[PDB]
Design a protein around this ligand. Structure first.
Ligand code: HEC
Ligand code: HEM
Lengths: 294, 103
């Protein structure tokens, strides 16, 4: 029968401008509720939501993926590796009421694109057309990664999303943003110092800090640097794999490059599993609040 | 503004790189103790960039408010990355706590 086919369908006569408006709403609100999480803002959490809703994809049968906006069903919503994202869901329900035409899938991803651009990351082309799908399309819990693993679980977990080594190392640089919260996941601390602005700190920290493995209070082990940062097993594993390590060095050295691979990957991540007819509009590049005088 | 709301704003957005204790260690950035009255690029014990020493501007309560809104637009080629305070109540409360803690 072959896998399922998910054709992107533009929302009835909407266009860039209709979508630049959604961005602006999201963008502004990130400017407005800036107290969240000790002033980190809603940035990190929205980029994490973007990733989780997309990370359920399975290229073998094409199930999961951003398409269906199924994170909105309890099954998915309640997946334990999804702890803490309710905070991201709430932040956009308002905006959803404002624009009830956009699908759930189009909102969760546009949101991560806004947060990256709004935190000064690179521009991320984006496309619309995700369509909402019945409660039955909800992926079972468990398609998302474990933190407590090594380079090899990582390399393989990612072949399921169809990503290579360079794409996996680039994606991980997103670990420059936010931190881990012990109540959410058993780990605690930030990867770096600028938790809300997008740079390549992730990679300089990985290689310039002095990491020591230790146990947190949740009783898990993590790598702590004297400077107050932490690295999860899966992050550290990036410098123990000879092959991951040369991409990590590239990136610590050249932000533009990182910036270019990340954008290519992040978008590839968000569009996985979706077929765009040859008549759909070219991907959009949205303007920031800065670029609009704000 | 108030000094109680400025104490939670500095211990959340800053503090991980700067410090308000007299004679503190340099983590990722220089020390802010004694920043009102000194020029940009004068802290000893830290390596600055070529865009922070060439500007050389006195840090007062009127010119420091423009650097908080946009650190990359005011000084092109800076190393400390920071989104930027876009509210007038967050810039007036952070400057009142930086004047009493950094004396
Ligand atoms: C690292 C991630 C930092 C964060 C978060 C904040 N600051 Fe920063 N600051 C940092 C560095 C590495 C430097 C030097 C940059 C260089 O190009 O050399 C700075 C510099 C400043 C300055 C200028 C100091 C001077 O000219 O003597 C100021 C006024 C300053 N930083 C203040 C500041 C505030 C108020 C912050 C949060 C809002 C903040 N910094 C965050 C490192 C980091
Ligand atoms: C091996 C794969 C990965 C693992 C095991 C993993 C694990 C984690 C964990 C355990 C946390 C902290 C959760 C919390 O306490 O809220 C986290 C946070 C986060 N993750 Fe990852 N991650 C992976 C890949 C990614 C990717 C590919 C991206 C993005 C493009 C991403 C983006 C983020 C961000 C932005 C945060 C911070 C969220 C916040 O501040 O609330 N992660 N990750």
């Amino acid at each position: 029968t072959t896998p399922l086919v998910h054709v992107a369908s533009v929302e009835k006569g909407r266009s860039y401008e209709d979508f630049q408006k959604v961005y602006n709403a999201i963008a502004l609100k990130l400017r407005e509720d800036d107290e969240y999480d000790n002033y980190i803002g809603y940035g990190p959490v929205l980029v994490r939501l973007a990733w989780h809703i997309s990370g359920t994809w399975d290229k073998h049968d094409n199930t999961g993926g951003s398409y269906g906006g199924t994170y909105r069903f309890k099954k998915e919503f309640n997946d334990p590796s999804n702890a803490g994202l309710q905070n991201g869901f709430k932040f956009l329900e308002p905006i959803h009421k404002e624009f009830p035409w956009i699908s759930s899938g189009d909102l969760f991803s546009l949101g991560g694109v806004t947060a990256v651009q709004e935190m000064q990351g690179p521009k991320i082309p984006w496309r619309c057309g995700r369509v909402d799908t019945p409660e039955d399309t909800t992926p079972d819990n468990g398609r998302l990664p474990d933190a407590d693993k090594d380079a090899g679980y990582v390399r393989t977990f990612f072949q399921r999303l169809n990503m290579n080594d360079r794409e996996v190392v680039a994606l991980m640089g997103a670990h420059a943003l936010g931190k881990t919260h012990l109540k959410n996941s058993g780990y605690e601390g930030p990867w770096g110092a600028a938790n809300n602005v997008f740079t390549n700190e992730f990679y300089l920290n990985l290689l310039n800090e002095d990491w020591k493995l230790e146990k947190n209070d949740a009783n898990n082990e993590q790598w702590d640097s004297k400077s107050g940062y932490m690295m999860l097993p899966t992050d550290y594993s990036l410098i123990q794999d000879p092959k991951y390590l040369s991409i990590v060095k590239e990136y610590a050295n050249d932000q533009d490059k990182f910036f270019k691979d990340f954008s290519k990957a992040f978008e590839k991540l968000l569009e996985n599993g979706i077929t765009f007819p040859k008549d759909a509009p070219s991907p959009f590049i949205f303007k920031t609040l800065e670029e609009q005088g704000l | 503004g108030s000094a109680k709301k400025g104490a939670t704003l500095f211990k959340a957005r800053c503090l991980q790189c700067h410090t308000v204790e007299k004679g503190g260690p340099h983590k990722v950035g220089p020390n802010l103790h004694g920043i009102f009255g000194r020029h940009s690029g004068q802290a000893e014990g830290y390596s600055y960039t070529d865009a922070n020493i060439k500007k050389n501007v006195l840090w007062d309560e009127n010119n420091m408010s423009e650097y908080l809104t946009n650190p990359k637009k005011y000084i092109p080629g800076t190393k400390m990355a920071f989104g930027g305070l876009k509210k007038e109540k967050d810039r007036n409360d952070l400057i009142t706590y930086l004047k009493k803690a950094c004396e």
